[PDB]
Enzyme design. Structure first.
Site, short mmCIF file in Angstrom:
data_model
loop_
_atom_site.label_atom_id
_atom_site.label_comp_id
_atom_site.label_asym_id
_atom_site.label_seq_id
_atom_site.Cartn_x
_atom_site.Cartn_y
_atom_site.Cartn_z
N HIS A 1 0.85 -1.22 0.00
CA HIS A 1 0.00 0.00 0.00
C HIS A 1 0.87 1.25 0.00
N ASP B 1 11.15 21.83 -24.92
CA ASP B 1 11.03 20.51 -24.27
C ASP B 1 11.89 20.52 -23.00
N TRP C 1 7.09 -0.26 4.92
CA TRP C 1 7.76 0.40 3.78
C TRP C 1 9.18 0.86 4.14
N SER D 1 15.15 6.17 -11.66
CA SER D 1 14.15 6.95 -12.43
C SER D 1 14.14 8.38 -11.91
N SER D 2 13.94 8.53 -10.60
CA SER D 2 13.80 9.85 -9.98
C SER D 2 15.11 10.66 -9.99
N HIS E 1 12.82 11.52 5.57
CA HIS E 1 12.20 12.82 5.90
C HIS E 1 12.21 13.70 4.63
N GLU F 1 12.01 12.76 1.66
CA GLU F 1 11.00 12.14 0.81
C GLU F 1 9.61 12.73 1.10
N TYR G 1 8.83 15.72 2.11
CA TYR G 1 8.84 17.10 1.53
C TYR G 1 8.78 17.01 -0.01
N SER H 1 -0.61 26.90 -4.93
CA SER H 1 -0.35 28.35 -5.18
C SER H 1 -0.99 28.75 -6.53
N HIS I 1 13.72 12.38 14.21
CA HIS I 1 12.38 12.38 14.83
C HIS I 1 11.62 11.08 14.51
N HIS I 2 12.14 10.25 13.62
CA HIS I 2 11.57 8.92 13.32
C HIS I 2 12.17 7.87 14.27
N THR J 1 6.40 27.04 6.80
CA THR J 1 5.14 26.41 6.36
C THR J 1 3.96 27.37 6.65
N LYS K 1 3.50 30.01 4.12
CA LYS K 1 2.78 29.56 2.91
C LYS K 1 1.29 29.54 3.19
N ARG L 1 0.67 0.47 15.43
CA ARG L 1 0.75 0.29 13.97
C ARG L 1 1.01 -1.16 13.60
C1 HEA Z 1 3.43 14.77 2.84
C2 HEA Z 1 3.88 14.07 3.83
C3 HEA Z 1 4.34 14.63 5.11
C4 HEA Z 1 4.55 15.95 5.49
C5 HEA Z 1 4.55 17.18 4.69
C6 HEA Z 1 4.88 15.83 6.93
C7 HEA Z 1 5.19 16.95 7.70
C8 HEA Z 1 5.60 16.96 9.07
N1 HEA Z 1 5.72 15.83 9.81
FE1 HEA Z 1 5.37 13.92 9.27
N2 HEA Z 1 5.19 12.02 8.62
C9 HEA Z 1 4.81 11.56 7.41
C10 HEA Z 1 4.46 12.42 6.29
C11 HEA Z 1 4.53 13.83 6.33
N3 HEA Z 1 4.91 14.57 7.37
C12 HEA Z 1 4.88 10.13 7.27
C13 HEA Z 1 4.57 9.26 6.13
C14 HEA Z 1 5.28 9.68 8.55
C15 HEA Z 1 5.45 8.26 9.05
C16 HEA Z 1 6.65 7.56 8.52
C17 HEA Z 1 6.53 6.10 8.93
O1 HEA Z 1 6.90 5.83 10.13
O2 HEA Z 1 6.07 5.25 8.12
C18 HEA Z 1 5.40 10.91 9.32
C19 HEA Z 1 5.95 10.86 10.63
C20 HEA Z 1 6.35 12.02 11.39
C21 HEA Z 1 7.03 11.93 12.70
C22 HEA Z 1 7.51 10.65 13.36
C23 HEA Z 1 6.45 10.22 14.41
C24 HEA Z 1 6.72 8.81 14.91
O3 HEA Z 1 6.92 7.89 14.07
O4 HEA Z 1 6.65 8.65 16.16
C25 HEA Z 1 7.19 13.28 13.11
C26 HEA Z 1 7.98 13.66 14.29
O5 HEA Z 1 8.27 14.83 14.50
C27 HEA Z 1 6.62 14.11 12.00
C28 HEA Z 1 6.51 15.54 12.08
C29 HEA Z 1 6.12 16.33 10.98
C30 HEA Z 1 6.23 17.77 11.08
C31 HEA Z 1 6.64 18.63 12.23
C32 HEA Z 1 5.87 18.21 9.78
C33 HEA Z 1 5.84 19.65 9.34
O6 HEA Z 1 6.45 19.73 8.04
C34 HEA Z 1 4.37 20.16 9.38
C35 HEA Z 1 4.41 21.67 9.30
C36 HEA Z 1 3.04 22.29 9.10
C37 HEA Z 1 2.33 22.99 9.99
C38 HEA Z 1 2.78 23.22 11.40
C39 HEA Z 1 0.95 23.47 9.60
C40 HEA Z 1 0.86 24.88 9.00
C41 HEA Z 1 1.47 25.93 9.83
C42 HEA Z 1 0.78 26.97 10.37
C43 HEA Z 1 -0.68 27.19 10.11
C44 HEA Z 1 1.62 27.99 11.18
C45 HEA Z 1 1.30 28.06 12.63
C46 HEA Z 1 1.72 26.77 13.30
C47 HEA Z 1 2.37 26.64 14.46
C48 HEA Z 1 2.80 27.80 15.27
C49 HEA Z 1 2.64 25.26 15.04
N4 HEA Z 1 5.97 13.31 11.08
C1 HEA Z 2 0.51 8.89 -0.63
C2 HEA Z 2 0.52 8.10 0.42
C3 HEA Z 2 -0.70 7.47 0.97
C4 HEA Z 2 -2.08 7.58 0.66
C5 HEA Z 2 -2.75 8.43 -0.34
C6 HEA Z 2 -2.74 6.64 1.58
C7 HEA Z 2 -4.14 6.45 1.53
C8 HEA Z 2 -4.91 5.57 2.36
N1 HEA Z 2 -4.32 4.80 3.36
FE1 HEA Z 2 -2.38 4.66 3.83
N2 HEA Z 2 -0.44 4.51 4.25
C9 HEA Z 2 0.60 5.15 3.75
C10 HEA Z 2 0.54 6.07 2.63
C11 HEA Z 2 -0.68 6.47 2.04
N3 HEA Z 2 -1.88 5.97 2.39
C12 HEA Z 2 1.90 4.82 4.35
C13 HEA Z 2 3.22 5.36 4.02
C14 HEA Z 2 1.58 3.87 5.39
C15 HEA Z 2 2.50 3.17 6.38
C16 HEA Z 2 2.96 1.83 5.81
C17 HEA Z 2 3.78 1.06 6.88
O1 HEA Z 2 3.35 1.10 8.08
O2 HEA Z 2 4.89 0.52 6.55
C18 HEA Z 2 0.15 3.79 5.25
C19 HEA Z 2 -0.56 2.99 6.18
C20 HEA Z 2 -1.97 2.89 6.25
C21 HEA Z 2 -2.69 2.29 7.40
C22 HEA Z 2 -2.06 1.73 8.68
C23 HEA Z 2 -1.85 0.23 8.54
C24 HEA Z 2 -1.28 -0.39 9.82
O3 HEA Z 2 -0.51 0.31 10.55
O4 HEA Z 2 -1.58 -1.61 10.06
C25 HEA Z 2 -4.08 2.42 7.05
C26 HEA Z 2 -5.15 2.01 7.93
O5 HEA Z 2 -6.31 2.30 7.73
C27 HEA Z 2 -4.15 3.10 5.75
C28 HEA Z 2 -5.33 3.35 5.04
C29 HEA Z 2 -5.36 4.19 3.87
C30 HEA Z 2 -6.67 4.50 3.29
C31 HEA Z 2 -8.00 3.97 3.70
C32 HEA Z 2 -6.35 5.43 2.24
C33 HEA Z 2 -7.34 6.06 1.35
O6 HEA Z 2 -7.53 7.42 1.81
C34 HEA Z 2 -6.99 5.89 -0.09
C35 HEA Z 2 -8.21 6.42 -0.92
C36 HEA Z 2 -7.86 6.57 -2.35
C37 HEA Z 2 -7.27 7.63 -2.86
C38 HEA Z 2 -6.82 8.73 -2.00
C39 HEA Z 2 -7.07 7.78 -4.39
C40 HEA Z 2 -5.89 7.29 -4.94
C41 HEA Z 2 -5.70 7.56 -6.46
C42 HEA Z 2 -5.38 8.67 -7.14
C43 HEA Z 2 -5.16 10.00 -6.45
C44 HEA Z 2 -5.23 8.51 -8.65
C45 HEA Z 2 -6.07 9.61 -9.29
C46 HEA Z 2 -6.23 9.46 -10.79
C47 HEA Z 2 -5.90 10.46 -11.60
C48 HEA Z 2 -5.33 11.77 -11.10
C49 HEA Z 2 -6.10 10.29 -13.07
N4 HEA Z 2 -2.84 3.31 5.25
O1 PER Z 3 8.54 12.51 7.77
O2 PER Z 3 7.54 13.57 8.61
CU CU Z 4 10.20 13.05 9.14
#
Ligand code: HEA
Ligand code: HEA
Ligand code: PER
Ligand code: CU
Ligand code: CDL
Ligand code: CDL
Ligand code: PEK
Ligand code: PEK
Ligand code: PGV
Ligand code: DMU
Ligand code: DMU
Ligand code: DMU
Ligand code: CHD
Ligand code: CHD
Ligand code: CUA
Ligand code: CA
Lengths: 56, 75, 72, 513, 44, 227, 258, 75, 72
Positions: D61, D91, D126, D156-157, D240, D242, D244, D255, D290-291, D316, D319, D438
């Protein structure tokens, strides 16, 4: 050795519509066919190998 | 003696080297005493501390390797 | 200039290589192999190697590379 | 002709189209995996099997949604289609290498589906941590096929990043400085720099895992003096950045969408938006541990990673506030794309804020490896990255195709998906705070109510995904051809018509100093 | 090469019913695959 | 343990878990306020026919947008780091217990005095006694003295695990070749439950932790009886 | 067209390269697990065919067809710099692994570096010679560059031949050191870090030497002008990269790690 | 015992650290054996080696500093 | 250009200084001075200093710099 670049410039600029990978002549077609045959045939073999490896 | 006290040499979550150091110190002490014909009782503190801290399987494996001649630490 | 880099190639760089070739030449010849000790952190085998009998490293040298069970 | 055009492409638009088709197909695979997860969790007791088949599904998934859906759509699809048009370039810099970035993905995907078909699958997460991912606890080919899948996706990337950076630096009109490029272009340049620096470290780490599994190395095996925690540092040094990489192109699309449907010529605070994306990119490299707050690192290290992680909220927030200031005084058009973008601003903010909760190492002790983390990342991925993809898709579909969507159907689609994703993920906060771990196929009985509601949510989202397919069909079935597009003076990608000719900017734009 | 709406794609939109079949097969195959993989794992 | 329809944390059993509840309350107020303000401002930007579409000056407003978030982050970080360093403070434990993770059960070692060790496995659903909790009970509980500072050391003899007890604020990864330390102090007698918190294969869901907190005299007699 | 950029002819090499990657990876899987080299040998063959034809076509496009305007050449410069950066970060992962293991040696090693039972190579013997060889090759390649800019065909060929000879000498010396080494890749994290880091370096030396040989034959065929020779510049940049990685390996693994 | 044997830890012309190490080892041992009320005869080897190698003025200065509380080495 | 270096000055460099200034200004508190021990390798006096009474270092701080005979 002698500079024969002008002769290659003439060959590769000939207005014959050939893409650059075939513009050297018949040897290019042969090497292309060998490459694509090994690629497509190897890919079919990789899928057979998956079929095999998917079961005990 | 209740348990191994806080040791400022090993203040962090990772206590691996605390177990290892006390195991080495006990066996170095035991070798130094048995050599002169002195008393292994002087080594007791290191024994209590490594027994408290060290997983049973680590001690068992290290003892086996000392007997085999494959223990990689200096005693 | 090309002249200066050729001067450095023949006047410094290749003389350095010749001196280090001499140095390696002089310190060559086989040093005695150490007593075998079956240390558990060495001669690791978690999966057979995908060549030979599975138990020989890729550039195995019988003179200096013991197997897990000792020298051949 | 078909082979020359679609297998031998050197055209940024056709290659973009191939990426969008690939990503759409990958999205269906990822959605089916997500529904298998929620089908298991929607009732206490075992449905499918023990945790192995369950975690094969969870692992797949994640890899599918990240590597095969989000990155190919945002970077390969929107990036290839839009970046050259937005800078007036004919291009990409390396139009043949671009094609190889695309064609590496079907093989990468095949290796992932092979991983799941052979032996018992890769039930690793993953993150692929050893020793569970090693040759004792995961004997046989599954994890090696997963590693090779990631190698091909990485190449690829990396090649795509080289292509985007070179194109964006080198192929603008000579009068156009970097400070006259659109924000989407900046978002792709910054994403590409993150890819270039992060993926090679992943490649090193998974290569070490491959050699531990097959060549009797011990990088991660304590018996040889290795350390499983080293793998985690190498993985997260990539991981991390990744996340961003997953969001930045989304920020660039948001935007453009907010500006466009506000009736504005320009986003509020352009240079602040550029500053914010570069600050997020930079800070994204110094926060990875932080992970790892529960692995046993030193207190001062935990204090640093807490503090550095929280700092990301400042750029952030600039933005988020700048998007709101772009809406301010707008002639708002309530298009479907605008609805996706407004959903993004709010739901991304919620997920960012739960990230700030997690950044606190003391509280993360209790939240780590719980559903609180799952709630955080699905707000930012399933309601952030995905909402930016859907907004950009409905906004630019008429550019790419020359046909219009039915706006009423697209609004219905948005409404259903909004309900489904919120019903799915909101209750996972409660599961996390109350301690549901999890990667569990089954849970103690107390957690039943929220898991039941969460699973019901996932079925609503499935209904939305099925409707989206129908909506794309109805657009191609009806053939409503585009006539006029507003605001072309500040949206260059539209100015060559819908769709643009195969070759655009054969004669470049005129821009004087 | 053909230019314009319906011509800049690797699939035909000349017939909306043939297109529905192609889209059904395309998206349906992706959605079905994981169910058939799970079935495959359960049947070992 | 968790209870049906639970919204927040398990009730605190240790002073540090109490501290974490008040710190979470403080942080959540901020999360609520910021979420609410963004939603409100969106709704405000979208509910007027009045327009202003000419270029707008950004630098004054960006000062507010950076300084106010920076202040808020400091107001989160200060109590956050106070708690982080409070958990790290030197305490002087009375007892050291080791736990070793395995596929799929925990072993416990109490070796301060005697060689006491045993394995702790989940009670299968088919063998639960009336009133017992599915997936949470074990055959052999981790008996410990209440109101005493305990050093817990955690490792693994196979893959990664993680030893967690939410009501005491505990989660320490179980890594082979590594001995991780945490401190445990229960304010109360009773039974405190947790679950393996690192994916570890086929029975990850099914290797729970049950602490049994009793007076020292009872702990001493249990210890003697387990030799 | 009235821009200076290169619209590339539709090409099969991206697809053949992508399929060669599938065959090499599925081939390594088949070798590690199903005791068969067949797919791997097909993948290596198709990969070599793809590289040959792709880079042949770039020479046709540039030397023979004149598509490399200054704007195109500037793009290629950025492309090669960015590729080198990605390779630096790849090696960084291996250096991280090395420092992680060596700075905190575990009890299994004897809690020391080098580990108990490891007898490191003398850094003052062949490793020092290898250092002198790659540094010397950085001097000779610079001579070659200046000779080419100054229009001197004979001295360019001599300097480039010397550079390639030194690359080959390094490779033969390293092959000999591999064979003679009393430790192996299976000798714990010492052998792991040593052979994987120096082995990826050795591969890059072979790649760089091959690139220099391509430049040598292109020079023999008069492809390069005194002002237009990006393939040579790219090979020289790559070669300096290989030198610098070696110096870091020498200081880190051979000297500081001994 | 005739004199201090070759020690592979100190194979070079500079023998400063050989004198220092054996002085520390003697006094660390004497403190260990006194701490349990063990027996100092166990420490004899170290005493003979430092007495053999160390300049009288170094030994006498180090002795005075241990008595003063100013000896900078850890005993 | 100048615009880029100004952007780095105000967007990266001066924010870094501000963050380090905040960090320093948080750990600015006075630490508990360590017990005086008259170590022979410290408080060296081979010749009187050419200022004051000859026994005080140039930036002598009474709170943290003991004399050879101890804290003032
Ligand atoms: C698009 C994906 C994405 C993005 C952008 C982020 C953004 C951030 N993530 Fe997240 N994160 C994940 C995807 C993402 N993360 C995934 C996939 C994991 C799990 C990995 C795994 O274990 O599988 C995860 C896990 C993860 C952890 C590990 C937790 C754990 O495993 O125990 C932490 C720890 O600090 C973290 C923090 C943050 C923070 C601080 C941001 C910041 O960038 C967020 C900043 C944004 C804001 C704060 C909101 C807007 C701001 C305002 C409106 C201003 C005012 C706000 C304040 C004064 C607070 N995330
Ligand atoms: C991009 C990343 C992404 C997205 C979108 C999702 C979407 C969803 N995920 Fe998650 N998920 C993860 C990344 C994502 N996930 C990751 C990183 C983990 C952790 C894995 C691990 O623990 O190792 C995770 C784990 C995870 C868990 C925890 C499992 C566990 O700990 O046992 C669950 C549980 O409900 C869940 C559910 C879902 C559901 C119901 C959706 C739904 O919201 C999905 C609904 C469908 C969509 C959102 C549409 C998708 C398609 C398109 C957008 C194509 C569009 C077509 C055109 C543009 C032409 N996912
Ligand atoms: O990786 O938040
Ligand atoms: Cu991180
Ligand atoms: C379309 C979508 C469909 C709906 C989706 C599913 C809906 C879920 C329903 C939840 C209702 C729960 C319930 O039984 O209510 C009774 C419940 C009974 O009250 P209670 O038991 O006294 O609860 C007090 C807790 O002790 C209070 O203390 P605690 O420690 O027990 O509570 C902490 C807890 C409690 O937090 C909550 O109660 C969540 C409130 C929901 C926000 C709306 O959880 C959280 O931390 C939640 C994390 C949320 C992350 C941030 C979300 C951003 C907010 C967005 C702002 C927009 C405003 C409009 O009433 C509620 O509190 C309602 C909720
Ligand atoms: C390994 C793979 C690595 C990839 C290398 C990329 C090479 C890109 C160069 C290229 O494709 O240009 C060929 C290409 C041949 O000419 P063309 O464009 O094919 O034909 C018209 C030209 O304009 C002709 O104009 P021209 O000014 O280029 O003159 C070239 C040629 C014109 O002759 C022709 O090509 C047409 C005449 C028909 C005969 C066709 C026979 C050629 C078949 C090639 C098969 C190679 C397959 C590789 C895969 C093997 C897998 C088992 O005239 C000749 O008399 C030379 C004969 C052909 C030279 C190439 C032979 C390659 C041997 C294989 C080496 C790979 C190993 O010439 C160029 O355009 C430049 C060539 C000059 C550089 C060649 C240098 C090869 C160096 C090999 C390195 C070995 C490393 C040893 C390891 C030791 C490490 C310590
Ligand atoms: C604040 C930022 C840095 C400021 C720099 C220094 C300020 C004052 C002096 C200026 C000149 C410095 C140059 C280097 C010389 C030596 C010492 C300077 C370092 C210094 O300032 O060190 C101070 C001592 O200065 C001392 O002794 C006395 C210092 C004064 C006498 C110096 C005389 C020696 C001059 C030597 C000249 C040689 C020139 C070389 C020429 C070469 C050409 C071939 C330290 O204070 P303290 O109380 O011991 O400890 C702090 C306790 N709280
Ligand atoms: C003279 C230097 C040149 C090196 C060339 C030699 C061998 C083949 C190719 C090597 C490629 C480089 C690194 C790959 C990893 C391991 C090899 C390390 C170097 C080497 O050759 O190591 C040898 C072991 O080889 C072994 O296991 C052999 C293993 C052979 C199979 C290699 C498996 C390849 C792994 C896949 C690579 C993934 C790449 C990722 C790309 C990035 C995508 C994002 C050492 O011999 P030994 O007998 O143990 O000790 C010596 C005792 N007398
Ligand atoms: C046993 C080992 C097997 C492994 C496989 C790899 C082995 C060998 C690969 C060797 C690399 C050979 C590259 C040859 C490139 C020839 C084409 C070339 O050099 O093309 C030049 C352009 O540069 C360009 O494309 C620049 C092109 C640069 C690309 C090179 C990058 C190195 C490749 C790395 C490959 C894998 C490395 C990763 C391993 C982990 C052409 O422009 P000019 O020179 O200006 O000429 C024009 C003038 O004549 C006009 O007057
Ligand atoms: C252009 C199209 C591309 C060409 C595709 C070619 C495919 C045909 C290859 C033949 O297949 C082989 O069969 C052998 C059976 O004899 C296998 O032997 C291997 O398996 C044997 C099993 O008996 C073992 O003895 C050994 O491991 C080994 O010889 C080997 O793996 C396998 O490759
Ligand atoms: C957090 C979202 C709230 C958004 C607030 C945005 C505030 C924008 C105000 C800046 O625009 C100004 O408006 C003035 C006329 O009123 C003009 O005279 C002035 O030239 C212009 O710069
Ligand atoms: C141009 C397209 C048409 C050509 C197709 C290619 C045909 C090649 C099929 C041969 O298959 C081979 O069989 C060998 C034995 O039958 C295997 O050696 C295997 O067995 C050996 C001894 O049996 C071992 O020493 C080796 O380690 C081991 O890999 C080898 O792997 C495998 O490749
Ligand atoms: C005779 C020939 C002329 C090349 C030409 O101008 O066409 C010369 C010029 C430079 C010569 C090369 C260089 O002198 C460097 C090498 C010297 C070796 O002694 C022979 C091979 C070697 C690689 C030479 C082969 C050949 O004789 C070359 C290529
Ligand atoms: C100087 C630079 C570019 C200005 C321009 O050339 O247009 C601008 C763009 C974004 C600005 C920054 C952002 O607006 C965010 C911050 C806002 C604060 O009020 C000042 C510091 C702050 C970090 C700003 C400093 C500086 O004014 C920046 C970096
Ligand atoms: Cu043990 Cu999960
Ligand atoms: Ca179930």
């Amino acid at each position: 050795f002698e500079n024969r670049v002008a002769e290659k410039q003439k060959l590769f600029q000939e207005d014959n519509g050939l893409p650059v990978h075939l513009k050297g002549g018949a040897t290019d077609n042969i090497l292309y066919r060998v490459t694509m045959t090994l690629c497509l045939g190897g890919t079919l073999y990789s899928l057979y190998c998956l079929g095999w490896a998917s079961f005990p | 003696y209740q348990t191994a006290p806080f040791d400022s040499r090993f203040p962090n979550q990772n206590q691996t080297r605390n177990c290892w150091q006390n195991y080495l110190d006990f066996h170095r002490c035991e070798k130094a005493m048995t050599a002169k014909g002195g008393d292994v009782s002087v080594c007791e503190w290191y024994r209590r501390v490594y027994k408290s801290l060290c997983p049973i399987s680590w001690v068992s494996t290290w003892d086996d390797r000392r007997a085999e001649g494959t223990f990689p630490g200096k005693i | 200039g090309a002249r200066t880099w050729r001067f450095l190639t023949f006047g410094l760089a290749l003389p350095s290589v010749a001196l280090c070739t001499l140095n390696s030449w002089l310190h060559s010849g086989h040093r005695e192999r150490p007593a075998f000790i079956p240390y558990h952190h060495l001669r690791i085998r978690t999966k057979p190697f995908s060549w030979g009998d599975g138990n020989h490293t890729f550039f195995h040298n019988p003179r200096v590379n013991p197997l897990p069970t000792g020298y051949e | 002709m078909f082979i020359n055009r679609w297998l031998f492409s050197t055209n940024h638009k056709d290659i973009g189209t191939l990426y969008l088709l690939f990503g759409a197909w990958a999205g269906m695979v990822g959605t089916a995996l997500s529904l298998l997860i929620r089908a298991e969790l929607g009732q206490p007791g075992t449905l499918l099997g023990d945790d192995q088949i369950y975690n094969v599904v969870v692992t797949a998934h994640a890899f599918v949604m990240i590597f095969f859906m989000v990155m190919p759509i945002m970077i390969g699809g929107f990036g290839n289609w839009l970046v050259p048009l937005m800078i007036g370039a004919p291009d990409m810099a390396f139009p043949r290498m671009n094609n190889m970035s695309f064609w590496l993905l079907p093989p990468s995907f095949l290796l992932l589906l092979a991983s799941s078909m052979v032996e018992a699958g890769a039930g690793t997460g993953w993150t692929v941590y050893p020793p569970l991912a090693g040759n004792l606890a995961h004997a046989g080919a599954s994890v090696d096929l997963t590693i090779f899948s990631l190698h091909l996706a990485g190449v690829s990337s990396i090649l795509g990043a080289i292509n985007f950076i070179t194109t964006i630096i080198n192929m603008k009109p000579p009068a156009m400085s970097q400070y006259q490029t659109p924000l989407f272009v900046w978002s792709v340049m910054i994403t590409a720099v993150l890819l270039l620096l992060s993926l090679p470290v992943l490649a090193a780490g998974i290569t070490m895992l491959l050699t531990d599994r097959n060549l009797n190395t011990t990088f991660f095996d304590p018996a040889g003096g290795g350390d499983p925690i080293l793998y985690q540092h190498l993985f997260w040094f990539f991981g991390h950045p990744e996340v961003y990489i997953l969001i930045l192109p989304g920020f660039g699309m948001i935007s453009h969408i907010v500006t466009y449907y506000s009736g504005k010529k320009e986003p509020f605070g352009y240079m602040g938006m550029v500053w914010a994306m570069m600050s997020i990119g930079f800070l994204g490299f110094i926060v990875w541990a932080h992970h790892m707050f529960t692995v046993g690192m030193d207190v001062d290290t935990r204090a640093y990673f807490t503090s550095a992680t929280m700092i990301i909220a400042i750029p952030t927030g600039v933005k988020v506030f700048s998007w709101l200031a772009t809406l301010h005084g707008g002639n708002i058009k309530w298009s479907p794309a605008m609805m996706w973008a407004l959903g993004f601003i709010f739901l991304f903010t919620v997920g960012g804020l739960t990230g700030i909760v997690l950044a606190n190492s003391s509280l993360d002790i209790v939240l780590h490896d719980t559903y609180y983390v799952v709630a955080h990342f699905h707000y930012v991925l399933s309601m952030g990255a995905v909402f930016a993809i859907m907004g950009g898709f409905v906004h630019w579909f008429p550019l790419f195709s020359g046909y219009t969507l039915n706006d009423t159907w697209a609004k219905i689609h948005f409404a259903i998906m909004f309900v489904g994703v919120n019903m799915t993920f909101f209750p996972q906060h409660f599961l996390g705070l109350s301690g549901m771990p999890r990667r569990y196929s089954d849970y103690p009985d107390a957690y039943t109510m929220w898991n039941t509601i969460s699973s019901m949510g996932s079925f609503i989202s499935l209904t939305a995904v099925m409707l989206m397919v129908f909506i794309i069909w109805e657009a191609f079935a009806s053939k409503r051809e585009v006539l006029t597009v507003d605001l072309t003076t500040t949206n260059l990608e539209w100015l060559n018509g819908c769709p643009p000719p195969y070759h655009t900017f054969e004669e470049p734009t005129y821009v004087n100093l | 090469y053909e230019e314009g709406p319906g011509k800049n794609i690797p699939f035909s939109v000349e017939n909306k019913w043939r297109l529905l079949a192609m889209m059904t097969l395309f998206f349906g195959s992706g959605f079905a695959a994981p169910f058939f993989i799970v079935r495959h794992q359960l049947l070992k | 343990m968790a209870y049906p329809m639970q919204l927040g944390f398990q009730d605190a059993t240790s002073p540090i878990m109490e501290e974490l509840l008040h710190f979470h309350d403080h942080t959540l107020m901020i999360v609520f306020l910021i979420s609410s303000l963004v939603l409100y401002i969106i709704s405000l930007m979208l509910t007027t026919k009045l327009t202003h579409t000419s270029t707008m000056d950004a630098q004054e407003v960006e000062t507010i947008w950076t300084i106010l978030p920076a202040i808020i982050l400091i107001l989160i970080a200060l109590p956050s780091l106070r708690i982080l360093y409070m958990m790290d403070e030197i305490n002087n434990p009375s007892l050291t217990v080791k736990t070793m993770g395995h596929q799929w059960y925990w072993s416990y070692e109490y070796t301060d005095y005697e060689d006491l060790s045993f394995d702790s496995y989940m009670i299968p659903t088919s063998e639960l006694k009336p009133g017992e909790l599915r997936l949470l009970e074990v055959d052999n509980r981790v008996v410990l003295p209440m109101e005493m500072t305990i050093r817990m050391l955690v490792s693994s003899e196979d893959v990664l695990h993680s030893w967690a007890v939410p009501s005491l604020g505990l989660k320490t990864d179980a890594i082979p070749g590594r001995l991780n330390q945490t401190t445990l102090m229960s304010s109360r007698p009773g039974l405190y439950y947790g679950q393996c918190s690192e994916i570890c294969g086929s029975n990850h869901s099914f290797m729970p932790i049950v602490l049994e907190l009793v007076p020292l005299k009872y702990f001493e007699k249990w210890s003697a009886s387990m030799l | 067209q009235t821009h200076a950029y290169h619209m590339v002819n539709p090409s099969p090499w991206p697809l053949t390269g992508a399929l060669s990657a599938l065959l090499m990876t599925s081939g390594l899987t088949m070798w590690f697990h199903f005791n068969s080299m067949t797919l791997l040998m097909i993948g290596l063959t198709t990969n070599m065919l793809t590289m040959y034809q792709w880079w042949r076509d770039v020479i046709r496009e540039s030397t023979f067809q004149g598509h490399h305007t200054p704007a195109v050449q500037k793009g290629l410069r950025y492309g090669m710099i960015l590729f080198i950066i990605s390779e630096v970060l790849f090696f960084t992962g291996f250096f991280w692994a090395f420092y992680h293991s060596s700075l905190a040696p575990t009890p299994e090693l004897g809690g020391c570096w080098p580990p108990t039972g490891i007898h490191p190579l003398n850094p003052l013997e062949v490793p020092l010679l290898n250092t002198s060889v790659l540094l010397a090759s950085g001097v000779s390649i610079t001579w070659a560059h200046h000779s080419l800019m100054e229009g001197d065909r004979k001295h360019m060929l001599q300097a480039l031949f010397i550079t390639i000879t030194l690359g080959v000498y390094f490779t033969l010396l390293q092959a000999s050191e591999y064979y003679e080494a009393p430790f192996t890749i299976s000798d714990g994290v010492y052998g792991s870090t040593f052979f994987v880091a120096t082995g990826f370096h050795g591969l890059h030396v072979i790649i760089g030497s091959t690139f220099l040989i391509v430049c040598f034959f292109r020079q023999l065929k008069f492809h390069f002008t005194s002002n237009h020779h990006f393939g040579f510049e790219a090979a020289a940049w790559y070669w300096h990269f290989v030198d610098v990685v070696w110096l870091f390996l020498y200081v880190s693994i051979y000297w500081w790690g001994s």
